Design a protein around this ligand. Structure first.
Ligand SMILES: Cc1ncsc1-c1ccc(CNC(=O)[C@@H]2C[C@@H](O)CN2C(=O)[C@@H](NC(=O)C2(F)CC2)C(C)(C)C)cc1
Lengths: 141, 87, 104
């Protein structure tokens, strides 16, 4: 369902990482498989060659936490006007306090030890159910 | 302006905009102008209030969003509170 | 520009914002609306320094980029009981426990 269209019409894009995370751009290929691309350090940008109708999303490279691009989940390169590239502004979401706490806890506790934490079983499940692109594709479908 | 009082387990009284506290569906339920939290100490509830301000300020805003900071020492308790308050 | 504050006295903490261009006195009016005490029964402080009514919050060092939504700046508050002002007392927040072993 969610997949890039094989349009063959070039579109030049700037991936602009305005987050404090290392960014993993993910291209959804013509069969809908996520293809990872080179990472972007915090605050950096890359001018890249993509195509109209192609689908992209953006993740924290280390944790797979979800990021926004032009304020939304998916970015689709448009027609370039006057030879100008399309800007893809990658930013942090306003995470819920719960998701933000899960992130921090996941960053300090090796997954084998989630179970040693003194919390209700459902929070163990929340920790183990870490962000993943496949899960988000099944949702977004 | 309408404020509400959120009181920590150790007796610290946090006064915040009603609108901000309604971020939390649990707090909304506890109001329908003061709520006592017997399990949430002040080092946690103070951060919860800071989150409300942060959320209201940065929700639907194109100005770059900074990371919401959480010290390791409070992360577990803050997680538990966030789960209770559904925020 | 908005500045984000915690106005603190004893075990009371008010979360609010104000303009960088707003005055100390105008902040007392805000406190008055919440705690029901007039500006002349209030002293405001930055750390140990007593703030003058006529100064802007900016002049007194509360700026948009240091008094942030997620890390607000602290303004101390003291009340006058009868004739004389109490000393500035801000009860600290509780202490986090030791990090569990699995978080080290
Ligand atoms: C350097 C860099 N850093 C972060 S991402 C990145 C980057 C590095 C290389 C590229 C090269 N461009 C591509 O791979 C584009 C992106 C996406 O639209 C798919 N793509 C293609 O060229 C695809 N080609 C096509 O669709 C066509 F050739 C039929 C037009 C591929 C070869 C993968 C089938 C793009 C971005």
């Amino acid at each position: 369902v969610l997949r890039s269209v094989n349009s063959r019409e070039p579109s030049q894009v700037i991936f602009c990482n305005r987050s404090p995370r290392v960014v993993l751009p993910v291209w959804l290929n013509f069969d809908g498989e996520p293809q990872p691309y080179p990472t972007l350090p915090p605050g950096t940008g890359r001018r890249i060659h993509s195509y109209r109708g192609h689908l992209w999303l953006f993740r924290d490279a280390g944790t797979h936490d979800g990021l926004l691009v032009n304020q939304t989940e998916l970015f689709v390169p448009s027609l370039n006007v006057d030879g100008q590239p399309i800007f893809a502004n990658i930013t942090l979401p306003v995470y819920t306090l719960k998701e933000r706490c899960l992130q921090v806890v996941r960053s300090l506790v090796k997954p084998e030890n989630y179970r040693r934490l003194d919390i209700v079983r459902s929070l163990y499940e929340d920790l183990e159910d870490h962000p993943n692109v496949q899960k988000d594709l099944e949702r977004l479908t | 302006m309408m404020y509400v009082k959120l009181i920590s387990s150790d007796g610290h009284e946090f006064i915040v905009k009603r609108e901000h506290a309604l971020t939390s569906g649990t707090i909304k339920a506890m109001l329908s102008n003061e709520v006592n939290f017997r399990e949430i100490p002040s080092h946690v509830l103070s951060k919860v209030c800071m989150y409300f301000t942060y959320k209201v300020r940065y929700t639907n805003s194109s100005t770059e969003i900074p990371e919401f900071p959480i010290a390791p020492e409070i992360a577990l308790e803050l997680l538990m509170a966030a789960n209770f308050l559904d925020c | 520009m908005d500045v984000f504050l915690m106005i603190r006295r004893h075990k009371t903490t008010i979360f609010t914002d104000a303009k960088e261009s707003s005055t100390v006195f105008e902040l007392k009016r805000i406190v008055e609306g919440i705690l029901k005490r007039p500006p002349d029964e209030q002293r405001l402080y930055k750390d140990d320094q007593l703030l003058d009514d006529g100064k802007t919050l900016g002049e007194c060092g509360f700026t948009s980029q240091t008094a942030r939504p997620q890390a607000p700046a602290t303004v101390g508050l003291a009340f006058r009981a009868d004739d004389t002002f109490e000393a500035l007392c801000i009860e600290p927040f509780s202490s986090p426990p030791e990090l569990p072993d699995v978080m080290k």
